[PDB]
Paper text:
Here we show that spd_1642-1643 in Streptococcus pneumoniae, a Gram-positive respiratory pathogen, encodes an ET uptake ATP-binding cassette (ABC) transporter, designated EgtU. The TMD (EgtUB) and SBD (EgtUC) are fused into a single chain, denoted EgtUBC encoded by spd_1642. The solute binding domain (SBD) of EgtU, EgtUC, binds ET with high affinity and exquisite specificity in a cleft between the two subdomains, with cation-π interactions engaging the betaine moiety and a network of water molecules that surround the thioimidazole ring.
The 2.44 Å structure of the holo EgtUC contains the wild-type EgtUC residues 233-506, while the 1.82 Å structure, termed EgtUCCTT, has the C-terminal five residues, GLLKK, replaced by the pair of amino acids VC. The structures are virtually identical with a pairwise heavy-atom RMSD of 0.206 Å over the common regions (residues 233–501), and we therefore use the higher resolution EgtUCCTT-ET structure to describe its features. The structure of EgtUC includes two globular subdomains connected by a hinge consisting of two strands ≈10 residues long, with the ligand bound in the cleft between subdomains. The domain D1 consists of residues 233-331 and C-terminal residues 445–506, while D2 encompasses residues 341–432. Each domain is characterized by a five-stranded β-sheet surrounded by five or six α-helices. As in some other subcluster F-III quaternary ammonium compound (QAC) binding proteins, notably Archaeoglobus fulgidus ProX (specific for GB), B. subtilis OpuBC (choline)42 and B. subtilis OpuCC (broad QAC substrate specificity), the aromatic residues Y341, Y419, Y443 and F293 form four sides of a pentagon and contribute cation-π interactions, while the base of the pentagon is formed by N339. The carboxyl group of ET makes electrostatic interactions with K242, T296 and R379.
Residue numbers in the entry: 232 to 506
């Protein structure tokens, strides 16, 4: 009896796909449940609305994104990642009755990024330094980063930056910065393209960006129905360095390895999955 099947969705990129396959591998080995991974399912609002609607069951959400985008009104949080997790976990349970499991170790932040040659040429070390050259350089940003208070709106409001911005599809912005259509983009800190393309990350000197650590987000009612999901997925909690996650993103995203295979090999190596 009772092989219930779980929809596990990613945001856009190798990393949510890798994390979703990690959830699927853990759930299938350790529970009576199957999982289906939905790669590139959405951006943050679509995953969040789909999770509330029951059109998906689990996706990885990140701690500053719960506080900054999902919680309304957004709370004023410290820059300590542990405190930022507890605010995100308690807030989203209160607001929406989502259960937000314990975060992994690594942070994947938004990172205002330029070519290394561009930072050398224009004296750019911090995000404040872009105010020197905000009429000399063009940015390409993801639409959600433009849409987000901790994104380009934060670049305006906290930094006073009015960048010349083209909106980009997320899968195209790294190639645009690498080819030279743009000179600034909203990198993600564990993205393999940062090292691959010799991008240098501008320092967040006013600290616009909160901590972002990933964790499973699910409805409380699913976790009431399947309380073993908490023990099983919290295997990942406090685990996976930034350097480990970047290499997994390289394996899927750059070497074109399948995300289930990269996920399963990592968890086996890490002692978290069989064989
Ligand atoms: C991890 N992150 C860098 C903090 C972002 C990345 C992201 C936002 N939208 C999509 S798609 N990806 C997020 O998940 O909110």
């Amino acid at each position: 009896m009772e092989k219930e099947n779980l929809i596990i969705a990613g945001k856009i990129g190798p990393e949510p796909e890798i994390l979703a396959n990690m959830y699927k591998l853990l759930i299938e080995e350790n529970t009576s449940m199957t999982a289906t991974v939905k790669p590139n399912f959405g951006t943050t609002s679509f995953l969040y609305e789909a999770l509330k609607k029951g059109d998906i069951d689990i996706y990885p959400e990140f701690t500053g994104t719960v506080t900054e985008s999902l919680l309304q009104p957004s709370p004023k949080v410290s820059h300590e990642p542990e405190q930022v997790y507890q605010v995100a976990r308690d807030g989203i349970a209160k607001q929406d009755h989502l259960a937000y499991l314990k975060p992994m170790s690594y942070q994947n932040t938004y990172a205002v990024a330029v070519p290394k040659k561009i930072a050398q040429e224009y004296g750019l070390k911090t995000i404040s330094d872009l105010k020197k050259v905000e009429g000399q350089l063009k940015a390409g940003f993801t639409l959600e980063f433009n849409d987000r208070e901790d994104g380009n709106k934060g670049l305006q409001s906290m930094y006073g930056l009015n960048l010349n911005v083209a909106t980009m599809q997320p899968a195209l912005r790294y190639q645009a910065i690498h080819s030279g259509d743009i000179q600034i983009t909203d990198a993600y800190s564990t993205d393999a393209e940062l090292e691959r393309y010799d991008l240098q990350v501008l320092e967040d000197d006013k600290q616009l960006f909160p901590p972002y650590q990933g964790a499973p987000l699910m409805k409380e009612a699913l976790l009431k129905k399947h309380p073993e999901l908490e023990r099983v997925l919290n295997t990942l909690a406090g685990k996976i360095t930034e350097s480990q996650m970047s290499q997994l993103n390289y394996q899927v995203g750059v070497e074109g390895k399948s995300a289930k295979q990269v996920a399963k090999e990592f968890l086996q190596e890490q002692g978290l999955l069989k064989k």
